Write a protein that binds this ligand. Sequence first.
Ligand SMILES: NC(=O)c1ccc(OCP(=O)(O)O)c2c1Cc1scnc1-2
Ligand SMILES: NC(=O)c1ccc(OCP(=O)(O)O)c2c1Cc1scnc1-2
Ligand SMILES: NC(=O)c1ccc(OCP(=O)(O)O)c2c1Cc1scnc1-2
Ligand SMILES: NC(=O)c1ccc(OCP(=O)(O)O)c2c1Cc1scnc1-2
Lengths: 318, 317, 319, 318
Amino acid sequence: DVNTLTRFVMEEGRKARGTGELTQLLNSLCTAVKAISSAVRKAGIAHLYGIAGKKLDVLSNDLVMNMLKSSFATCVLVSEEDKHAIIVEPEKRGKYVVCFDPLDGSSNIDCLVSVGTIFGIYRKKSTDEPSEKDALQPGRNLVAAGYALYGSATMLVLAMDCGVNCFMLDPAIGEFILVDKDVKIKKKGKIYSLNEGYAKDFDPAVTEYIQRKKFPPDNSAPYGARYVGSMVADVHRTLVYGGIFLYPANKKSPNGKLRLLYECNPMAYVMEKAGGMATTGKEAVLDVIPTDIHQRAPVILGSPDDVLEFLKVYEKHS
Amino acid sequence: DVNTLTRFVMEEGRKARGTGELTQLLNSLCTAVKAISSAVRKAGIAHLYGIAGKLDVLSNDLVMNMLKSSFATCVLVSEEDKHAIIVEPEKRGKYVVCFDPLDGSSNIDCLVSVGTIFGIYRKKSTDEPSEKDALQPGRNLVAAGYALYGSATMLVLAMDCGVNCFMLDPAIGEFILVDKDVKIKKKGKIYSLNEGYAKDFDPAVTEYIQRKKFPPDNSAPYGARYVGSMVADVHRTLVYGGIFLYPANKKSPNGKLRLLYECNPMAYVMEKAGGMATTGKEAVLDVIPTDIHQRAPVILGSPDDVLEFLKVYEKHS
Amino acid sequence: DVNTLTRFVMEEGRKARGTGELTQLLNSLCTAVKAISSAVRKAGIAHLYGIAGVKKLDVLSNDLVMNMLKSSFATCVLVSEEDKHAIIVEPEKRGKYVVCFDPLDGSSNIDCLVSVGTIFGIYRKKSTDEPSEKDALQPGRNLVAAGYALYGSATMLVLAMDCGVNCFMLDPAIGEFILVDKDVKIKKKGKIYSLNEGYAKDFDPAVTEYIQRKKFPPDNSAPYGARYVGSMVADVHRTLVYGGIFLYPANKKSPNGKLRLLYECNPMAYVMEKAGGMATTGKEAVLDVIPTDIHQRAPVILGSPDDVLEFLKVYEKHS
Amino acid sequence: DVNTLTRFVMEEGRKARGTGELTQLLNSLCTAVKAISSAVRKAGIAHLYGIAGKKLDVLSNDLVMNMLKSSFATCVLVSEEDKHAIIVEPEKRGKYVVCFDPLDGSSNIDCLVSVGTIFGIYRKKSTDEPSEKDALQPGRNLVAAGYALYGSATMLVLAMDCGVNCFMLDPAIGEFILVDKDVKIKKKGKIYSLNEGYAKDFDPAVTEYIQRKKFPPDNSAPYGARYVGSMVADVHRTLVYGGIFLYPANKKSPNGKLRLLYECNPMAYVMEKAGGMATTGKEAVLDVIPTDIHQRAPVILGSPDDVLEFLKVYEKHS
Ligand SMILES: NC(=O)c1ccc(OCP(=O)(O)O)c2c1Cc1scnc1-2
Ligand SMILES: NC(=O)c1ccc(OCP(=O)(O)O)c2c1Cc1scnc1-2
Ligand SMILES: NC(=O)c1ccc(OCP(=O)(O)O)c2c1Cc1scnc1-2
Ligand SMILES: NC(=O)c1ccc(OCP(=O)(O)O)c2c1Cc1scnc1-2
């Protein structure tokens, strides 16, 4: 029996016996993702080049912002594109807070590298008028999170209490088809992923861990390396094939490089619901209590056995 | 003035004052690429999952059938077939095509970028068409390039007139020229290779990479990128500059990538863009093949970067 | 503020405070319509012609609607022209709704690329017994929702319910039905008449006179223009958009008409009335006919109120 | 062996051993048709209705005009949209003259009625400077003509000396696939098509002919009636199923309503190449010598036996 994102979300929402807001929020997000996908694949670019005689990152942010506002299900929206949190006007306010990266990896979009949209949804905790503070909740409080990967094909990965589910976008009918149910990551993988160009500035624990991947002390087979440079692409591969992904702090970026609210937490949430792990090295990414919407956070995630191994090394140097 | 792949190819073909075969060959290849793109993006997958109650193989079938039906080819070598395919007499043309229908499909499960690579040669002898016709050095290529099915689909075509990039507009199924006579940066800031092979690296590769991470002159270290799909990594190299490596080692003296449909085409694109592509010992394009599926080591990209690698290579030779 | 079919239906369903079944039913129908549209526009036809080295569209369309409706868990009885008998949903997937539909209206002459469409009518099961064909034998007056999808120059879904008639345009770039016309109302009177005049010889006297009045106005006013696509969804939609009248009447040859009551007449009659229009068999409102056979035919004259009323005047003159 | 419009045209052009201009002209027209089709099917309409926060007839004209000019194959362009003939600038001039209707039937497009693009291509016959006069050639001089129908699906019908060929647009790959080769219309059909709302003003010959279709003299079954209201739709159905199409002259319109250069001649050309007929009642549409680029012309076309029958009636009243 075929299942669609719309059908799947509607059913889960029905079981929750709530107001239906999260359902509308996700439906709206889904529509925005399809619009972003269409623009990313360059539909209509011919008109830009004069067949008849805005930047993608900006368009993507506009699509998400507008669809979420018009869903009547949100009150505070934090985007990687905007310096300040966006406060939804009173007549369209809902009880949810959304932190998102409209188009992850767009910086190197020129090379047609895979790009994506990352999102994390929280239920407003405070009763105060909506403000940026409502987005400062630990990832542990997420009600839903995931991402859309615009790679060889477009896929939406949605994680919630019921687990992780993957939907493939069928461009013929503009429908997200459920192709992988209640996904779980491999206990242990054979791929490590990180920008080794930072080698010179790596912390000792990262240096040793990577060394163990290339020169297994037990003389087992060395791990293969992959690093697309786009978090959504690297994380998704990690989910599908297992292994480990790292974007640790650098000497130059003492608090890591990736952002906690819309890059780390969402992926950490997907990973844990898939039976995986995500740590800053000191604690679970999901337990970090944010003080700034754009603060950075180090992150090491993936197969449990792989992350545990890294933590062992980390502890040795602590 | 907008330009399309069809219009561009037709015009160049007209200037050559030939039979029009290469034009038809490229038109057919273009159509196949759009079909592969459509399937790669998973159009119609809903029917596979029961809404009404392999990609590598499909891609090879699309290229094979379109090329044969173009009446412009006589010998077809594919990464998917053990032996060279000989076009039936009634559909034979003067060209030989070596191609990889869907490069990087091995990891297609993670939705990693994939692509199609191709190299076109003019048959050199009047001998009945055979596998030998595809054993020409890349230096003899008349046209070569690839289609990248990434965030968007792009077709990169290299010929004597240079390198031109066309973006596929899915709304009208038309390849739009967006970058003309492309040239790669003299020097980049990104190195690309599977460092998981570190333990088995050749001494020259180990030192070169060490210089990218720990520049002896204390300059900024290079960033690392390795998609795992040749078309994706090579295209990034072309767009941003830098270097790409899939070298040889004691255990793989000739490398892992294939000369005919992976190395030669990319080497050709690189040189036409003012870049370089070496096996370490000689230019990839000068290697004279003896086997259609033979492997070849390859280091390509910005000239200053490749030259630097060669300096290190020489140091260990 | 943009609105989509999914958002619109979800909201209306929420206001009804029910089980959410009709919402799932409509979502599923929507998905099927997009799939039908894709196939109708011939996506992938290249594969059929050997680009890489097959079932009829009416059959595929029926399969799409049937499968999506069954999988919605919101239906129990499905009537289509395809199957002679009503389809009874298996117990484990039964919902409280009954759906009567025409998977691909006008497919008979589809080779000419004439506009085609999907027509549907949704009823709430009334009986307490086991689902059967009988549950589809309700007068159109009992419809909870009805409409059609027109696969013409563009694809549009017209949905009629108590709240009125709303038109959604399918944006192929994102596979989303965009609301472009809200609470639509048909013009009080139009200037176009639509029917197959090839049946002239067998026309009922009332139809003959009425048409005569459209071509040769009694008060020498401007004669009406004629349009007849041959596809009910196309002709009816034009009638809704431009106003006027559509006829597929009965006669000596066809005493009960040619179009089907359950999945052709009732749905269009429902859309017409919700839009402030009319739909009569000549004797009574189409919506009031109590069916005794799921495939029974019914004569139908619908469109602008003033035009239908005028027809009825002529009809009465011959009665 | 699959064939595409691009492949088909390139091959025919090669056999002509010319400059390649008509090939480029057709390729360019093909691209324009795909762009028009995309817009007609309303791709991107979501952006018009605010998903992120120019009329079709005008856009269509712009697409055809721009693509034809940029083909470097034309010198004079006549469109139903522009009062005066468009003269291609010197640096982009080619030897062909094109008369076209960018979007036929767009007047009633609000009802989603089928619409289409009609075109007729002539070779400039003069040696002087390009002018409106170069478009005043009888249809008999056409080198190529046809139309694109944007109906349930999009199809391009191309007629040339080699015959009539039909190509279906596959939206998945934006390719026109040849599905019907060297098409021939039925000797006799069973459908008549005309706006009977003009009955009161019908010419006596038209009145009698239609009367014969409804009340047959040989007691054969009456013809069925069909009238979409869009010439491309009605003419295509006539081609596919056979029969007859009429848009005759009456009391008020002695010269008919449809335009000779970009509506009548192209369809007349398609019909004759398909073994059909097209008459004004007095002579073959293709033999009319135009004196005004926008002049009207009566037209009766379709299956030969049907047109011949009409002509018999016409002669009876002459
Ligand atoms: N525990 C959960 O995962 C949970 C809790 C409350 C919910 O809805 C609450 P509402 O906003 O309707 O008040 C929803 C979920 C999963 C989904 S999917 C669509 N809605 C929900
Ligand atoms: N020098 C060149 O780059 C060259 C030589 C011969 C050619 O065709 C010869 P034909 O097959 O028509 O005999 C073509 C080219 C560039 C292009 S683009 C389309 N055709 C050609
Ligand atoms: N009066 C109405 O128009 C009405 C009554 C009950 C309904 O749902 C009942 P449910 O199946 O949820 O129990 C719905 C409607 C309009 C829409 S749109 C989606 N659902 C409904
Ligand atoms: N006999 C014909 O129908 C004829 C004559 C000359 C032609 O090309 C003349 P050119 O512009 O290349 O000089 C072409 C055709 C059919 C086609 S299809 C593409 N080109 C042609």
